[PDB]
Amino acid sequence: QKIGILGAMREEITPILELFGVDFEEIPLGGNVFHKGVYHNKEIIVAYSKIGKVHSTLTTTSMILAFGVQKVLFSGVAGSLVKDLKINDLLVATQLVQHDVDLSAFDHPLGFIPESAIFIETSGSLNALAKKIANEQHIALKEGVIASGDQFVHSKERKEFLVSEFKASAVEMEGASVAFVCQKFGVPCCVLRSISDNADEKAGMSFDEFLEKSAHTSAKFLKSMVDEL
Amino acid sequence: QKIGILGAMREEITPILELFGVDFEEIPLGGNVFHKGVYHNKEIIVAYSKIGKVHSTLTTTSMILAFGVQKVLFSGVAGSLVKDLKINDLLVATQLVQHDVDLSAFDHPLGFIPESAIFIETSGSLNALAKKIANEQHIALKEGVIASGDQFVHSKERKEFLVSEFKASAVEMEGASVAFVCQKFGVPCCVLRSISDNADEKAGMSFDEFLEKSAHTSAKFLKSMVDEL
Ligand SMILES: Nc1ncnc2c(CN3C[C@H](CSc4ccc(Cl)cc4)[C@@H](O)C3)c[nH]c12
């Protein structure tokens, strides 16, 4: 069984390599460093894509086509758009949207691109598994729509826009592209995110503080999922 | 010799399939339809990625990893940012930038993403070949920086921003991602673009009118390049 685990930054996958503690062979390809290893019975490929839609799309496509992963789990941090999502909170994405896509000039709704869709879906099977686990571990796992764009959102004006337009709960910069690539190749995808800030004027300061912790919370939960597979 | 030819829209590669007039086997993969064929001595893979950074990244990565193209030529239309670039004019990109990347909140210049670069380079060998040809055919081939983002630029305020910030000459939505993927895998890339509008308030109307023509001009020139390879 082949499983891919992606992170955007190195700081997001370092804990994953720790927690697994197995020997990882390092395979470089297309500017990314893939860590191939073996866990219990499963074959795990880990990597950080680097920041953004382009980077994350490249890596996910590479993972799938070069290593043939049969599932893809993502784990990293995000900025909270809602009052009931607090720092360190866990969330699993039901739908993802590219909030910065704009073809309005062609009388198209924001986030839409022809031959595609505004919202992209994630694995219903995996999202279930996460709910099961979050339940046994007594963890308050929330769920919702995640917004993705190539901008670091640090302002209330954008916060509101995202929530009203797309009804999003959290923002980040790679979730939508991973889910999108996985969808086009028929690979079940699950996107886990841990809250590192509130995407406000202070978003930058807070992000710097909690990155490390939030990355761990996220990493821990994902490990427990890989254990149940 | 394997060569990939990409377009963003179907309307941009239809002329390419015509002009080549050879039998194309149709191979579907990851939501894209790749047309594999044989020309003179070269093996050509053609396709349209669909619109945007994500789509174009997926297809380019697929082309390279699944078909093993040794070169990548892109051809499509774009919106003019400068006074000396008129409708139907041809341009070959020297550098490409993702104009919508914004990590300013982390005191980063616009368009920059850590572990990467703001401007990405294209094949110096191919760009030369294009200059040679544009010279023999008595064609006024211009060259410059191309801006790429997931927004259709139709407003003067953005026009100015792009030119002042990045010193761009033309805007489109896929050039930067293709060049980026090609760079990470060591594949020479050349991005040809034909002017279809001026990215102004009227950009949408004009685009609709010239799409078809501009796509042809671009398609013709690229064919002549493939002939010289
Ligand atoms: N308010 C927000 N907006 C968008 N994405 C995020 C994220 C999620 N990711 C974290 C990460 C932030 S960008 C960055 C750049 C330079 C340096 Cl040195 C540190 C961080 C990106 O992969 C998006 C958390 N908060 C976000």
Ligand SMILES: Nc1ncnc2c(CN3C[C@H](CSc4ccc(Cl)cc4)[C@@H](O)C3)c[nH]c12
């Ligand atoms: N002002 C501009 N801004 C950005 N890109 C372009 C381009 C280049 N491409 C054309 C194409 C325009 S989006 C579109 C959507 C729906 C329909 Cl039905 C027709 C066209 C994209 O692939 C970007 C030309 N002008 C541009």
